[PDB]
Amino acid sequence: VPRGSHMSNEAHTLVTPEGNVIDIQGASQENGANAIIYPRHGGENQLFFIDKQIGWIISVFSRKALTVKENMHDIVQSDYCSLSRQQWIFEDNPDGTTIIRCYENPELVLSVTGNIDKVCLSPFTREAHQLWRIE
Amino acid sequence: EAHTLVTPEGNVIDIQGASQENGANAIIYPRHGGENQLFFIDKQIGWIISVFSRKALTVKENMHDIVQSDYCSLSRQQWIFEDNPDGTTIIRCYENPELVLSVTGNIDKVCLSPFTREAHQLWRIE
Ligand SMILES: C[C@@H]1O[C@H](O)[C@H](O)[C@H](O)[C@H]1O
Numbered sequence: 001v002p003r004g005s006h007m008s009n010e011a012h013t014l015v016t017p018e019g020n021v022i023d024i025q026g027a028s029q030e031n032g033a034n035a036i037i038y039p040r041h042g043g044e045n046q047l048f049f050i051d052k053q054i055g056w057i058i059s060v061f062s063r064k065a066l067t068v069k070e071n072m073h074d075i076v077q078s079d080y081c082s083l084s085r086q087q088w089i090f091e092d093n094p095d096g097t098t099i100i101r102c103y104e105n106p107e108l109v110l111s112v113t114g115n116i117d118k119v120c121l122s123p124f125t126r127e128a129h130q131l132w133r134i135e
Numbered sequence: 136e137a138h139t140l141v142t143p144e145g146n147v148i149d150i151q152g153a154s155q156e157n158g159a160n161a162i163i164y165p166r167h168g169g170e171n172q173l174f175f176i177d178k179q180i181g182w183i184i185s186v187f188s189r190k191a192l193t194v195k196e197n198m199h200d201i202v203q204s205d206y207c208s209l210s211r212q213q214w215i216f217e218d219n220p221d222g223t224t225i226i227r228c229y230e231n232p233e234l235v236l237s238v239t240g241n242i243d244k245v246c247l248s249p250f251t252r253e254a255h256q257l258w259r260i261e
């Protein structure tokens with residue numbers, strides 16, 4: 001309906017340069033489940049809502065937020081709690097890629113531990129997997 | 136997926152002054168559909184989030200006053216939606232579900248009160 005509201009309804013994928021996607025491991029609905037890289041398969045555990053009014057990234061399947069652990073390296077899903085470790089700056093590049101920076105320390109950006117391995121937070125060095133495609 | 140929370144008279148929960156601040160009151164107001172009258176409700180989590188402010192409907196520690204505040208996964212920001220067959224809903228505070236979204240008067244403030252099946256305790260989520 002019944003209303004006009006300013007908020008994205010689109011489910012997104014977060015895509016690597018090889019075409020793989022951020023995926024919540026095991027299609028888990030639990031706190032602490034790892035974010036990993038996986039080939040795209042249509043499943044809801046690879047889809048995320050992104051709200052650029054506040055900067056959250058929420059799993060469509062679990063409704064939990066992409067979160068950097070307190071260690072400032074590991075990326076999991078966890079209940080949204082308005083934490084700086086759950087809020088992201090989307091730096092949009094002219095080529096259509098995006099640097100996804102941690103609000104708590106924006107020098108630390110969404111990265112991978114390997115091409116088809118885990119998602120992590122790492123210092124920005126313009127490494128290829130720090131340049132995401134939000135589809 | 137934005138909703139209004141509607142009273143029997145057709146008025147709605149409204150964040151006072153269209154405020155974006157922590158602690159702003161939830162009040163009853165004639166329906167205009169501005170974003171301070173619209174709320175995201177997610178029944179996987181149990182939150183009620185203002186579209187305009189992106190802050191959660193929150194019971195204060197006094198267990199009576201209703202405000203908005205940053206969502207911090209508090210039991211005082213989580214809600215049970217008890218759905219009746221005629222399309223009304225009792226919105227109960229997770230921290231103490233005997234206490235439910237209510238009003239201090241027909242077009243006055245939103246509060247938490249013991250459930251007595253008062254007409255303003257039976258919301259229509261539209
Ligand atoms: C069950 C399977 O688990 C994998 O770890 C990955 O999360 C996949 O997307 C999921 O379908």
Ligand SMILES: C[C@@H]1O[C@H](O)[C@H](O)[C@H](O)[C@H]1O
Pocket residue numbers: 149150151152153154164169171
């Ligand atoms: C400015 C005005 O303030 C009122 O208290 C109410 O919140 C209305 O919705 C808003 O439009």
